């Protein structure tokens, strides 16, 4: 939901 990008 927040920036979950690895």
């Amino acid at each position, epitope marked *: *939901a*927040p920036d979950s990008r690895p």
Partner: single-chain antibody
Amino acid sequence: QVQLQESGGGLVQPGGSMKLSCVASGFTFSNYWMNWVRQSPEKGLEWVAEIRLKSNNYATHYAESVKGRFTISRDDSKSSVYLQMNNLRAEDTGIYYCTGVGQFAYWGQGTTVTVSVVTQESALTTSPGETVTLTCRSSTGAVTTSNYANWVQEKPDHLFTGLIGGTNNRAPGVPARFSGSLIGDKAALTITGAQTEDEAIYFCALWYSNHWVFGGGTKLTVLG
């Protein structure tokens, strides 16, 4: 090394205006949301604003304390994020940082601005090779993976780096001794064999739909 470098801070009179900048290098800036967070003389961190991606039309969210006085923006072809601050007041005094990535892996050095609930353990003492556990509790109810708990380390003095994001994901290059968890209804960070260099303040942050709340921070003393 990744690098975020803030500028534009200084000394301002109440009622005044100031624009901060932050330039990113050494990674793909435009793939990540960015945030401003501010520390403040009482120690303690307060999230200020976020901005998302182009594909989100650069949507933004602000803490209520700054809503309508501050504006966050970004320029991807410049690798930059900005914080326009109007109507400053004494209580905006602090050190401001741009930070992002999974979800607070990277932090700038901070730029100082002088204008002139989440619960953690207060303090813990350890020594090298002991195991220590820090906890992060929510008054609103149970902490879950939907809160994307982060843990961030502040070394002496004002040097921040993200340790854990998404509850249990070590950020890249973080030493293996730092271990994130959900335990019962709390998030927790375990240092599995502390080292002398881990003396620092450890903050957690939880996500509540569209804003972050940072805890008060736990002061870790490491003897020996």
